[PDB]
């Protein structure tokens, strides 16, 4: 009764052949005649100084002004990016915080890491002081990423190879997303919030149905860990960043890889990815000192953000599209346009 082992290989071939049948022309062939973007030369407009050690994560508030960052110094800082002043500095229990998130409402932030817990902080208490409103316990491995759906719902990814949807009020996992065979490193919610994508150390990305808890599609191609993942702004595609020194673009409806973004002299891993507002530019952070701005349609490197003295660990583009934030192991965030 290991016709199941044959059957698995039959189905893998059918999927491969179905994908191949849809591969009639490449994205590059299709975008060959459009004008290139030209030289993108963004400048550092603001530097956020205040962290005492490596920055590990950041996330913009939906107002395109406030952002939260997490650091080895054991602080979560909420920054006013326009003035460079801090708004809040939240002391954490440990240094080893790997992710932070800003709720779309602006009412809460979240973070976690080697504690294996997603902590939720109320920014708008009656007292006027920030304090822990919930500690989401359940993962049996490190918290790698988290993103609020709303004030009562957050999605987490973990080194335990699962993702989960949480009801914050009850503190319970409402849905558990099982399927990955390696540490899950990053997640990105679809614009409409019905779907999300995860990237993991099994070198695959998975599309999940949020309500029904099922993996709908699995995307392969990367040769090593996927560390970063981000939806294209219309929700029909997403980009990944990997230890294999490439970013890749995957399409949901064609169910396959559309493009690789790479260069012969890039040997190090990608830590973070994000699209510009229109999706035309793909920005990626690297283990060396820089961020590369890629033409997402043509795969040309349009530019470089060179202003850190160590790893660019994280980045994000504002909802209004006005600026990119980079966070680094050199202990600074920088705001670029």
């Amino acid at each position: 009764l290991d016709q199941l082992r044959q059957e698995a290989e039959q189905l893998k071939n059918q999927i491969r052949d179905a994908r191949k049948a849809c591969a009639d022309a490449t994205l590059s062939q299709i975008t060959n005649n459009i004008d290139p973007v030209g030289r993108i030369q963004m400048r550092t407009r603001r530097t956020l100084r205040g962290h005492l050690a490596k920055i590990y994560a950041m996330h913009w508030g939906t107002d395109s002004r406030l952002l939260v960052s997490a650091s080895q110094d054991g602080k979560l800082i909420i920054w006013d990016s326009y003035t460079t002043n801090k708004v809040h500095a939240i002391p954490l229990r440990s240094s080893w915080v790997m992710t932070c998130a800003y709720a779309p409402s602006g009412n809460y932030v979240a973070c976690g890491g080697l504690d294996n817990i997603c902590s939720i902080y109320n920014l708008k208490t009656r007292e006027g002081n920030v304090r822990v409103s919930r500690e989401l316990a359940g993962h049996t491995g490190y918290l790698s990423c988290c993103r609020f759906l709303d004030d009562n719902q957050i999605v987490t990814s973990s080194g335990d190879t699962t993702c989960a949807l949480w009801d914050i009020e009850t503190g319970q996992q409402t849905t558990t997303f099982t399927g990955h065979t390696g540490d899950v490193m990053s997640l990105s919610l679809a614009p409409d919030t019905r779907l999300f994508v995860s990237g993991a150390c099994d070198a695959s990305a998975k599309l999940w149905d949020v309500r029904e808890g099922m993996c709908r599609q699995t995307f392969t191609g990367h040769e090593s860990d996927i560390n970063a993942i981000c939806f294209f702004p219309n929700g029909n595609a997403f980009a990944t960043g990997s230890d294999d020194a490439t970013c890749r673009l995957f399409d949901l409806r064609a169910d396959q890889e559309l493009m690789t973004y790479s260069h012969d002299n890039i040997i190090c891993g990608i830590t973070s990815v994000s699209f510009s507002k229109s999706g035309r530019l793909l920005l990626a952070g690297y283990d060396d000192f820089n961020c590369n701005v890629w033409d997402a349609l043509k795969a040309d490197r349009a530019g470089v953000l060179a202003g850190h003295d160590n790893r660019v660990s994280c980045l994000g583009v504002t909802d209004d599209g006005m600026a990119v934030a980079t966070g680094s192991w050199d202990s600074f965030l920088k705001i670029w346009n």
Partner: peptide
């Protein structure tokens, strides 16, 4: 698994 997290955090041991 801890090894990936140590690389991400910049720890050695």
């Amino acid at each position: 698994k801890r090894p990936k997290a140590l690389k991400l955090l910049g720890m050695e041991d």
